[PDB]
Design a protein around this ligand. Structure first.
Ligand code: ATP
Ligand code: YQH
Ligand code: MG
Ligand code: MG
Ligand code: ZN
Length: 360
Protein backbone atom coordinates (compact mmCIF):
# COMPACT_ATOMS: atom_id res chain seq x y z
CA UNK A 1 0.00 0.00 0.00
CA UNK A 2 2.62 2.62 1.21
CA UNK A 3 5.20 0.62 -0.79
CA UNK A 4 2.91 0.28 -3.87
CA UNK A 5 2.14 4.06 -3.91
CA UNK A 6 5.94 4.76 -3.71
CA UNK A 7 6.44 2.43 -6.73
CA UNK A 8 3.62 4.18 -8.65
CA UNK A 9 5.31 7.58 -7.96
CA UNK A 10 8.57 6.29 -9.59
CA UNK A 11 6.60 4.91 -12.63
CA UNK A 12 5.03 8.35 -13.42
CA UNK A 13 6.01 9.90 -16.80
CA UNK A 14 7.81 13.26 -16.93
CA UNK A 15 5.63 16.04 -18.41
CA UNK A 16 8.87 17.41 -20.04
CA UNK A 17 9.61 14.04 -21.74
CA UNK A 18 5.97 13.59 -22.88
CA UNK A 19 6.01 17.03 -24.59
CA UNK A 20 9.32 16.39 -26.45
CA UNK A 21 8.66 12.69 -27.33
CA UNK A 22 5.14 13.50 -28.71
CA UNK A 23 6.60 16.15 -31.06
CA UNK A 24 9.44 13.82 -32.17
CA UNK A 25 6.92 11.02 -32.90
CA UNK A 26 4.51 13.43 -34.69
CA UNK A 27 7.31 14.63 -37.02
CA UNK A 28 8.33 11.08 -37.99
CA UNK A 29 4.72 9.69 -38.30
CA UNK A 30 3.25 12.74 -40.26
CA UNK A 31 6.09 12.42 -42.75
CA UNK A 32 5.73 8.63 -43.24
CA UNK A 33 1.93 8.98 -43.65
CA UNK A 34 2.51 11.65 -46.38
CA UNK A 35 4.87 9.32 -48.40
CA UNK A 36 2.64 6.21 -48.18
CA UNK A 37 -0.34 8.28 -49.45
CA UNK A 38 1.52 8.74 -52.82
CA UNK A 39 1.55 4.94 -53.41
CA UNK A 40 -1.57 3.65 -55.32
CA UNK A 41 -2.15 0.75 -52.81
CA UNK A 42 -1.54 2.76 -49.59
CA UNK A 43 -3.73 5.71 -50.77
CA UNK A 44 -6.31 5.53 -47.96
CA UNK A 45 -3.70 5.11 -45.16
CA UNK A 46 -4.85 6.58 -41.85
CA UNK A 47 -3.26 7.00 -38.45
CA UNK A 48 -4.62 5.33 -35.26
CA UNK A 49 -2.70 5.96 -32.02
CA UNK A 50 -2.66 2.83 -29.83
CA UNK A 51 -0.89 1.01 -27.03
CA UNK A 52 0.09 2.02 -23.52
CA UNK A 53 1.17 5.59 -24.24
CA UNK A 54 -2.25 6.55 -25.66
CA UNK A 55 -4.02 4.48 -22.91
CA UNK A 56 -1.96 6.41 -20.26
CA UNK A 57 -0.55 3.13 -18.74
CA UNK A 58 2.96 3.54 -20.19
CA UNK A 59 5.42 3.33 -17.27
CA UNK A 60 8.86 4.80 -16.35
CA UNK A 61 9.49 6.75 -19.63
CA UNK A 62 7.47 7.77 -22.78
CA UNK A 63 9.99 5.82 -24.95
CA UNK A 64 7.73 3.39 -26.86
CA UNK A 65 4.78 4.49 -28.98
CA UNK A 66 2.51 2.25 -30.97
CA UNK A 67 0.68 3.33 -34.06
CA UNK A 68 -1.58 1.59 -36.63
CA UNK A 69 -1.37 2.69 -40.26
CA UNK A 70 -4.93 1.61 -41.08
CA UNK A 71 -6.18 1.01 -44.58
CA UNK A 72 -9.86 0.39 -45.38
CA UNK A 73 -10.06 -2.87 -47.46
CA UNK A 74 -13.67 -2.94 -48.83
CA UNK A 75 -15.43 -6.24 -49.90
CA UNK A 76 -12.96 -8.30 -47.76
CA UNK A 77 -13.67 -12.07 -47.29
CA UNK A 78 -12.02 -13.89 -44.36
CA UNK A 79 -10.94 -17.53 -44.12
CA UNK A 80 -9.95 -18.83 -40.65
CA UNK A 81 -6.48 -20.46 -40.63
CA UNK A 82 -6.43 -24.05 -39.20
CA UNK A 83 -9.16 -23.39 -36.52
CA UNK A 84 -6.78 -20.82 -34.79
CA UNK A 85 -9.77 -18.39 -34.29
CA UNK A 86 -7.43 -15.33 -34.42
CA UNK A 87 -5.52 -15.92 -37.73
CA UNK A 88 -7.08 -15.51 -41.15
CA UNK A 89 -6.44 -15.67 -44.86
CA UNK A 90 -7.70 -12.45 -46.56
CA UNK A 91 -9.68 -12.91 -49.85
CA UNK A 92 -11.88 -10.56 -51.96
CA UNK A 93 -15.64 -10.66 -52.75
CA UNK A 94 -17.26 -10.56 -56.27
CA UNK A 95 -17.74 -7.33 -58.40
CA UNK A 96 -15.81 -5.89 -61.45
CA UNK A 97 -14.61 -3.03 -59.11
CA UNK A 98 -10.90 -1.98 -59.30
CA UNK A 99 -8.82 -3.65 -56.52
CA UNK A 100 -5.93 -1.44 -55.20
CA UNK A 101 -4.33 -4.55 -53.60
CA UNK A 102 -4.16 -6.80 -56.79
CA UNK A 103 -0.34 -6.28 -56.58
CA UNK A 104 0.05 -8.38 -53.37
CA UNK A 105 -2.27 -11.27 -54.34
CA UNK A 106 -0.74 -14.77 -54.17
CA UNK A 107 -3.64 -16.40 -56.01
CA UNK A 108 -7.11 -15.66 -54.56
CA UNK A 109 -5.39 -14.64 -51.23
CA UNK A 110 -3.83 -11.26 -50.16
CA UNK A 111 -0.27 -12.10 -48.98
CA UNK A 112 0.53 -10.63 -45.53
CA UNK A 113 4.33 -11.12 -45.97
CA UNK A 114 4.38 -9.48 -49.44
CA UNK A 115 2.17 -6.51 -48.36
CA UNK A 116 4.19 -6.02 -45.10
CA UNK A 117 7.41 -6.28 -47.21
CA UNK A 118 6.41 -3.27 -49.41
CA UNK A 119 5.05 -1.28 -46.44
CA UNK A 120 8.45 -1.78 -44.66
CA UNK A 121 10.33 -0.91 -47.91
CA UNK A 122 8.49 2.45 -48.41
CA UNK A 123 9.22 3.30 -44.71
CA UNK A 124 12.91 2.12 -44.97
CA UNK A 125 13.52 4.35 -48.05
CA UNK A 126 11.65 7.39 -46.55
CA UNK A 127 13.34 7.21 -43.08
CA UNK A 128 16.86 7.77 -44.62
CA UNK A 129 15.79 10.52 -47.12
CA UNK A 130 14.49 13.72 -45.37
CA UNK A 131 16.30 14.76 -42.12
CA UNK A 132 15.80 17.30 -39.17
CA UNK A 133 15.70 14.03 -37.05
CA UNK A 134 17.83 10.81 -37.11
CA UNK A 135 15.57 7.72 -37.53
CA UNK A 136 16.93 4.12 -37.67
CA UNK A 137 14.89 0.97 -38.50
CA UNK A 138 15.46 -1.98 -36.11
CA UNK A 139 15.90 -5.58 -37.48
CA UNK A 140 12.64 -7.31 -38.61
CA UNK A 141 11.29 -9.57 -35.85
CA UNK A 142 10.04 -12.98 -37.01
CA UNK A 143 6.25 -13.19 -37.07
CA UNK A 144 5.75 -9.66 -35.50
CA UNK A 145 3.57 -7.26 -37.53
CA UNK A 146 5.61 -4.23 -36.31
CA UNK A 147 8.08 -2.09 -38.27
CA UNK A 148 10.13 -0.64 -35.40
CA UNK A 149 11.85 2.74 -35.64
CA UNK A 150 14.23 4.30 -33.12
CA UNK A 151 14.24 8.15 -32.99
CA UNK A 152 17.60 9.73 -31.89
CA UNK A 153 18.71 6.52 -30.00
CA UNK A 154 15.94 6.98 -27.33
CA UNK A 155 12.30 6.66 -28.46
CA UNK A 156 10.89 3.55 -30.24
CA UNK A 157 7.89 3.76 -32.57
CA UNK A 158 6.16 0.51 -33.56
CA UNK A 159 4.21 1.00 -36.74
CA UNK A 160 1.87 -1.72 -37.85
CA UNK A 161 -0.04 -1.83 -41.11
CA UNK A 162 -3.68 -2.62 -40.37
CA UNK A 163 -6.37 -3.73 -42.83
CA UNK A 164 -9.61 -2.05 -41.70
CA UNK A 165 -12.93 -3.83 -42.17
CA UNK A 166 -16.22 -2.03 -41.43
CA UNK A 167 -18.08 -5.40 -41.63
CA UNK A 168 -19.49 -7.17 -38.51
CA UNK A 169 -16.73 -8.77 -36.40
CA UNK A 170 -15.74 -12.41 -37.19
CA UNK A 171 -17.78 -15.26 -35.57
CA UNK A 172 -14.76 -16.11 -33.31
CA UNK A 173 -15.45 -12.81 -31.43
CA UNK A 174 -19.16 -13.58 -30.74
CA UNK A 175 -18.55 -14.63 -27.12
CA UNK A 176 -15.69 -12.18 -26.45
CA UNK A 177 -15.65 -8.64 -24.99
CA UNK A 178 -17.60 -9.77 -21.87
CA UNK A 179 -18.10 -6.19 -20.62
CA UNK A 180 -21.93 -6.32 -20.14
CA UNK A 181 -21.87 -6.27 -16.31
CA UNK A 182 -19.06 -3.72 -16.17
CA UNK A 183 -19.29 -1.19 -19.06
CA UNK A 184 -22.91 -2.22 -20.10
CA UNK A 185 -24.71 -4.19 -22.83
CA UNK A 186 -25.34 -0.80 -24.66
CA UNK A 187 -21.58 -0.10 -24.72
CA UNK A 188 -20.73 -3.65 -25.96
CA UNK A 189 -23.24 -3.24 -28.82
CA UNK A 190 -21.82 0.24 -29.72
CA UNK A 191 -18.19 -1.07 -29.68
CA UNK A 192 -19.02 -4.07 -31.92
CA UNK A 193 -20.55 -1.69 -34.54
CA UNK A 194 -17.01 -0.23 -34.85
CA UNK A 195 -14.41 -1.53 -37.43
CA UNK A 196 -12.00 -4.38 -36.66
CA UNK A 197 -8.39 -4.66 -37.86
CA UNK A 198 -6.10 -7.26 -39.36
CA UNK A 199 -2.38 -6.95 -38.78
CA UNK A 200 0.38 -8.93 -40.62
CA UNK A 201 1.27 -11.06 -37.57
CA UNK A 202 1.60 -14.62 -38.82
CA UNK A 203 0.39 -17.84 -37.13
CA UNK A 204 3.04 -20.02 -35.47
CA UNK A 205 3.60 -22.95 -37.87
CA UNK A 206 6.00 -25.35 -36.11
CA UNK A 207 9.45 -23.69 -36.21
CA UNK A 208 8.43 -21.07 -38.81
CA UNK A 209 5.22 -19.11 -39.57
CA UNK A 210 2.39 -19.25 -42.16
CA UNK A 211 3.58 -16.07 -43.95
CA UNK A 212 0.23 -15.39 -45.74
CA UNK A 213 -1.86 -15.17 -42.50
CA UNK A 214 -3.06 -11.95 -40.78
CA UNK A 215 -4.26 -11.67 -37.16
CA UNK A 216 -7.24 -9.84 -35.60
CA UNK A 217 -6.40 -6.65 -33.73
CA UNK A 218 -8.66 -4.77 -31.34
CA UNK A 219 -6.06 -2.18 -30.17
CA UNK A 220 -8.56 0.67 -30.85
CA UNK A 221 -11.20 -0.99 -28.54
CA UNK A 222 -8.58 -1.68 -25.86
CA UNK A 223 -7.60 2.01 -25.87
CA UNK A 224 -11.25 3.16 -25.72
CA UNK A 225 -11.92 0.89 -22.73
CA UNK A 226 -8.84 1.95 -20.78
CA UNK A 227 -9.65 5.65 -21.30
CA UNK A 228 -13.36 5.16 -20.37
CA UNK A 229 -13.02 2.29 -17.91
CA UNK A 230 -15.48 2.74 -15.06
CA UNK A 231 -19.01 1.51 -14.46
CA UNK A 232 -19.59 5.21 -13.54
CA UNK A 233 -19.40 7.54 -16.57
CA UNK A 234 -17.51 9.93 -14.21
CA UNK A 235 -14.91 7.35 -13.04
CA UNK A 236 -11.52 9.19 -12.47
CA UNK A 237 -13.08 12.57 -13.57
CA UNK A 238 -13.43 13.72 -9.90
CA UNK A 239 -11.66 13.29 -6.51
CA UNK A 240 -14.47 11.03 -5.08
CA UNK A 241 -14.20 8.61 -8.00
CA UNK A 242 -10.44 8.00 -8.34
CA UNK A 243 -10.24 4.20 -8.97
CA UNK A 244 -7.02 2.14 -8.92
CA UNK A 245 -7.62 0.15 -12.20
CA UNK A 246 -4.84 1.86 -14.17
CA UNK A 247 -2.48 1.76 -11.18
CA UNK A 248 -3.05 -2.00 -10.92
CA UNK A 249 -2.21 -2.44 -14.64
CA UNK A 250 0.93 -0.28 -14.28
CA UNK A 251 2.06 -2.34 -11.24
CA UNK A 252 1.43 -5.68 -13.13
CA UNK A 253 3.41 -4.32 -16.11
CA UNK A 254 6.29 -3.24 -13.82
CA UNK A 255 6.29 -6.58 -11.98
CA UNK A 256 6.74 -8.43 -15.27
CA UNK A 257 9.29 -5.92 -16.72
CA UNK A 258 11.36 -6.15 -13.46
CA UNK A 259 11.31 -9.96 -13.32
CA UNK A 260 12.33 -10.13 -17.04
CA UNK A 261 15.17 -7.65 -16.42
CA UNK A 262 16.60 -9.43 -13.30
CA UNK A 263 16.39 -12.91 -14.92
CA UNK A 264 18.32 -11.39 -17.94
CA UNK A 265 20.31 -14.66 -18.32
CA UNK A 266 17.41 -15.02 -20.88
CA UNK A 267 15.08 -17.69 -22.43
CA UNK A 268 13.00 -18.44 -19.25
CA UNK A 269 10.83 -15.35 -19.50
CA UNK A 270 11.36 -14.21 -23.19
CA UNK A 271 7.91 -15.44 -24.33
CA UNK A 272 6.01 -13.34 -21.73
CA UNK A 273 4.88 -9.86 -22.83
CA UNK A 274 3.07 -6.83 -21.41
CA UNK A 275 0.07 -7.93 -23.58
CA UNK A 276 -0.30 -11.04 -21.33
CA UNK A 277 -0.62 -8.79 -18.29
CA UNK A 278 -2.95 -6.36 -20.15
CA UNK A 279 -5.20 -9.30 -21.20
CA UNK A 280 -5.22 -10.77 -17.66
CA UNK A 281 -6.02 -7.28 -16.31
CA UNK A 282 -9.13 -6.93 -18.62
CA UNK A 283 -10.36 -10.33 -17.33
CA UNK A 284 -9.97 -9.07 -13.70
CA UNK A 285 -12.13 -6.01 -14.74
CA UNK A 286 -14.88 -8.38 -16.04
CA UNK A 287 -14.60 -10.31 -12.73
CA UNK A 288 -14.73 -7.12 -10.58
CA UNK A 289 -17.22 -4.90 -12.53
CA UNK A 290 -17.95 -2.35 -9.78
CA UNK A 291 -15.93 0.82 -9.27
CA UNK A 292 -16.26 0.03 -5.47
CA UNK A 293 -14.09 -3.08 -6.23
CA UNK A 294 -11.23 -0.72 -7.36
CA UNK A 295 -11.22 1.82 -4.53
CA UNK A 296 -7.92 3.74 -4.27
CA UNK A 297 -7.86 2.76 -0.53
CA UNK A 298 -7.83 -0.94 -1.56
CA UNK A 299 -4.80 -0.66 -3.90
CA UNK A 300 -2.98 -3.56 -2.14
CA UNK A 301 -6.01 -5.88 -2.37
CA UNK A 302 -6.82 -4.93 -6.01
CA UNK A 303 -3.22 -5.51 -7.05
CA UNK A 304 -3.32 -8.89 -5.26
CA UNK A 305 -6.57 -9.72 -7.23
CA UNK A 306 -4.55 -9.04 -10.44
CA UNK A 307 -1.50 -11.07 -9.24
CA UNK A 308 -3.60 -14.11 -8.12
CA UNK A 309 -5.62 -14.15 -11.41
CA UNK A 310 -2.35 -13.99 -13.44
CA UNK A 311 -0.95 -16.85 -11.28
CA UNK A 312 -4.16 -18.81 -12.01
CA UNK A 313 -3.64 -18.20 -15.80
CA UNK A 314 -0.06 -19.52 -15.59
CA UNK A 315 -0.98 -22.61 -13.46
CA UNK A 316 -4.01 -23.48 -15.67
CA UNK A 317 -2.05 -22.62 -18.93
CA UNK A 318 -5.11 -20.54 -19.87
CA UNK A 319 -5.20 -16.85 -20.85
CA UNK A 320 -8.00 -16.15 -23.34
CA UNK A 321 -7.54 -13.25 -25.76
CA UNK A 322 -10.16 -10.81 -24.34
CA UNK A 323 -11.94 -10.51 -27.75
CA UNK A 324 -11.34 -14.06 -29.17
CA UNK A 325 -12.21 -16.48 -26.28
CA UNK A 326 -10.91 -19.67 -27.98
CA UNK A 327 -7.52 -18.07 -28.70
CA UNK A 328 -5.39 -19.21 -25.73
CA UNK A 329 -2.32 -16.93 -25.30
CA UNK A 330 -0.94 -19.45 -22.69
CA UNK A 331 -1.36 -22.66 -24.75
CA UNK A 332 1.66 -25.07 -24.60
CA UNK A 333 1.88 -24.45 -28.39
CA UNK A 334 2.84 -20.83 -27.66
CA UNK A 335 4.58 -21.09 -24.27
CA UNK A 336 6.01 -24.29 -22.92
CA UNK A 337 4.90 -25.53 -19.49
CA UNK A 338 8.47 -25.12 -18.12
CA UNK A 339 8.46 -21.30 -18.74
CA UNK A 340 4.99 -20.88 -17.11
CA UNK A 341 6.05 -22.90 -14.05
CA UNK A 342 9.25 -20.79 -13.87
CA UNK A 343 7.26 -17.50 -13.91
CA UNK A 344 4.76 -18.93 -11.33
CA UNK A 345 7.65 -19.65 -8.88
CA UNK A 346 9.08 -16.08 -9.28
CA UNK A 347 5.66 -14.36 -8.94
CA UNK A 348 4.74 -16.61 -5.93
CA UNK A 349 8.07 -15.65 -4.27
CA UNK A 350 7.34 -11.94 -4.93
CA UNK A 351 3.76 -12.20 -3.62
CA UNK A 352 4.92 -14.07 -0.42
CA UNK A 353 7.62 -11.45 0.40
CA UNK A 354 5.61 -8.25 -0.29
CA UNK A 355 7.33 -7.77 -3.71
CA UNK A 356 11.06 -7.24 -2.86
CA UNK A 357 11.50 -6.66 -6.65
CA UNK A 358 9.78 -3.24 -6.02
CA UNK A 359 12.36 -2.28 -3.26
CA UNK A 360 14.59 0.81 -3.89
N1 ATP B 1 -0.18 -10.77 -28.87
C1 ATP B 1 -0.97 -9.74 -29.18
N2 ATP B 1 -2.24 -9.99 -29.57
C2 ATP B 1 -3.05 -8.97 -29.84
N3 ATP B 1 -2.79 -7.65 -29.79
C3 ATP B 1 -1.52 -7.43 -29.40
C4 ATP B 1 -0.58 -8.39 -29.07
N4 ATP B 1 0.61 -7.79 -28.67
C5 ATP B 1 0.38 -6.51 -28.81
N5 ATP B 1 -0.90 -6.22 -29.24
C6 ATP B 1 -1.51 -4.91 -29.38
O1 ATP B 1 -0.51 -3.97 -29.72
C7 ATP B 1 -0.51 -2.89 -28.77
C8 ATP B 1 0.89 -2.35 -28.64
O2 ATP B 1 1.72 -3.45 -28.25
P1 ATP B 1 2.90 -3.36 -27.23
O3 ATP B 1 3.76 -4.55 -27.13
O4 ATP B 1 3.68 -2.08 -27.45
O5 ATP B 1 2.26 -3.12 -25.78
P2 ATP B 1 1.66 -1.88 -24.98
O6 ATP B 1 0.22 -2.15 -24.70
O7 ATP B 1 1.80 -0.63 -25.85
O8 ATP B 1 2.53 -1.76 -23.66
P3 ATP B 1 4.07 -1.44 -23.44
O9 ATP B 1 4.51 -0.85 -24.77
O10 ATP B 1 4.05 -0.47 -22.31
O11 ATP B 1 4.74 -2.68 -22.96
C9 ATP B 1 -1.10 -3.51 -27.51
O12 ATP B 1 -1.61 -2.52 -26.62
C10 ATP B 1 -2.19 -4.40 -28.09
O13 ATP B 1 -3.32 -3.61 -28.45
C1 YQH C 1 6.62 -11.42 -31.00
C2 YQH C 1 5.13 -11.55 -30.92
O1 YQH C 1 4.62 -12.63 -30.65
C3 YQH C 1 4.27 -10.35 -31.18
C4 YQH C 1 2.88 -10.45 -31.12
C5 YQH C 1 2.08 -9.34 -31.35
C6 YQH C 1 2.65 -8.11 -31.67
N1 YQH C 1 1.89 -6.93 -31.92
C7 YQH C 1 0.59 -6.80 -32.31
O2 YQH C 1 -0.17 -7.76 -32.44
C8 YQH C 1 0.08 -5.43 -32.54
C9 YQH C 1 -1.29 -5.33 -32.93
N2 YQH C 1 -2.38 -5.29 -33.28
C10 YQH C 1 0.80 -4.27 -32.45
O3 YQH C 1 2.07 -4.30 -32.06
C11 YQH C 1 0.30 -2.89 -32.63
C12 YQH C 1 -1.05 -2.49 -32.52
N3 YQH C 1 -1.21 -1.21 -32.69
O4 YQH C 1 0.10 -0.71 -32.91
C13 YQH C 1 0.97 -1.72 -32.87
C14 YQH C 1 2.39 -1.37 -33.08
C15 YQH C 1 4.04 -7.99 -31.71
C16 YQH C 1 4.84 -9.10 -31.47
MG1 MG D 1 3.69 -0.14 -26.50
MG1 MG E 1 4.99 -1.99 -29.29
ZN1 ZN F 1 -11.44 5.09 -12.81
Amino acid sequence: ASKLRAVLEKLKLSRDDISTAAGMVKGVVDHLLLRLKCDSAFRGVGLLNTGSYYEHVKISAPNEFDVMFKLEVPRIQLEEYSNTRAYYFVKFKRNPKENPLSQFLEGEILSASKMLSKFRKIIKEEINDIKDTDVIMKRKRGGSPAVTLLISEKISVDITLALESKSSWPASTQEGLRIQNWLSAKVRKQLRLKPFYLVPKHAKEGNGFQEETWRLSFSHIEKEILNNHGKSKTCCENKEEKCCRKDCLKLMKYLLEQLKERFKDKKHLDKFSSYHVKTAFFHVCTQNPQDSQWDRKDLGLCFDNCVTYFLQCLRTEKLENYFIPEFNLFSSNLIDKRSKEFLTKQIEYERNNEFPVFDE
